[PDB]
């Protein structure tokens, strides 16, 4: 591609590609074989897909061919890390952490309950027995 007094010195891609925008032929010329040009053009004309900073909530984007790969911080997940694990504490999700019963309060935190025979512990998620022989528990094992 034309730039007057700069086109006097023969083909060098650190100049023509790596410092300025290499056209397709500019690349075929330097590489001769279109297959050697393939290897190059395939990624030279792909683009940094991570240019839009797709990852959210402190993620790290790694480029690929026509796509990216988001690396999520611990409490997030998703293609772009958009999902916060801490705002998913609902009963459809592993019984909301509750040992026995779970009740939503969508707009406030879910609550954990127990079965007749047990009581809620200090934590608000685990149950402990009140009667001697509770339901669902094999005594001779313990």
């Amino acid at each position: 591609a034309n730039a007057f007094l700069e086109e006097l010195r023969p083909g060098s891609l650190e100049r023509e590609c790596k410092e300025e925008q290499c056209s397709f032929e500019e690349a075929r010329e330097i590489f001769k074989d279109a297959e050697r040009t393939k290897l190059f053009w395939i990624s030279y004309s792909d683009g940094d897909q991570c240019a839009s900073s797709p990852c959210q909530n402190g993620g790290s984007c790694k480029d690929q061919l026509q796509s990216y790969i988001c690396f999520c911080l611990p409490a997030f997940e998703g293609r772009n890390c958009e999902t916060h694990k801490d705002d998913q504490l609902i009963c459809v999700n592993e019984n909301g952490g509750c040992e026995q019963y779970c009740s939503d309060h969508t707009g406030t935190k879910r609550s954990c309950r127990c079965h007749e025979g047990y009581s809620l512990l200090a934590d608000g998620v685990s149950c402990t027995p009140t009667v001697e022989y509770p339901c669902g528990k094999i005594p001779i094992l313990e």
Partner: protein, 191 residues
């Protein structure tokens, strides 16, 4: 509601995203996934998205085969209408991502072409592991230059010609596979 068809696994470097069709009309979905003889885990609750990220579940044991399903529900809220996916063992299906030459030192008569470490999603101990930490003895990086070379590590030590100045291009390969064996080639770098 309609059953959600066309389920395809999009895995590359252990980031797995199951996606299906169609775009929901008065529907929301919920994804379940499990290890064929284990409990069903619930993910992506009542999502208007036609895709779910199962990444955090597979990277728990990457050699386990996983099955999944997409539940269809009706707006507002017997068993739901659903569709199952294919059995997906990641360590044999997940794609290897584009490698990147990180450096090449000419140490006289032979050049060393160091490949950058490919990080996976297996967030072990804090930092994410690399594809060699996972695949190990099953991974080999290949190098095409101007002709071909093979390594069981991240660097190749090739015997080159004095004052000639070459070009390079690497590829991630798992030789045991029968299908999905190699990655896409790297961005060519010359001397």
């Amino acid at each position: 509601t309609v059953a959600a068809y066309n389920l395809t696994w999009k895995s590359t470097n252990f980031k797995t995203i199951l996606e299906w069709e169609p775009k929901p009309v008065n529907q929301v979905y919920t994804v379940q996934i499990s290890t064929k003889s284990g409990d069903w885990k619930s993910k992506c609750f009542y999502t208007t998205d036609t895709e779910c990220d199962l990444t955090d579940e597979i990277v728990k044991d990457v050699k386990q085969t996983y099955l999944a399903r997409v539940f269809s529900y009706p707006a507002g809220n017997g068993e739901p209408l659903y569709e199952n996916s294919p059995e997906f063992t990641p360590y044999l299906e997940t794609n290897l991502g584009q490698p990147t030459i990180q450096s090449f030192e000419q140490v006289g008569t032979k050049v060393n072409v160091t490949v950058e470490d490919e990080r996976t999603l297996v967030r072990r101990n804090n930092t994410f592991l690399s594809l060699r930490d996972v695949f190990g003895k099953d991974l080999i990086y290949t190098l095409y230059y101007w002709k071909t070379a093979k390594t069981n590590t991240n660097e190749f030590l090739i015997d080159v010609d004095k004052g000639e100045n070459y070009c390079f291009s690497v590829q991630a390969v798992i030789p045991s596979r029968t299908v999905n064996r190699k990655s896409t080639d790297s961005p060519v770098e010359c001397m």
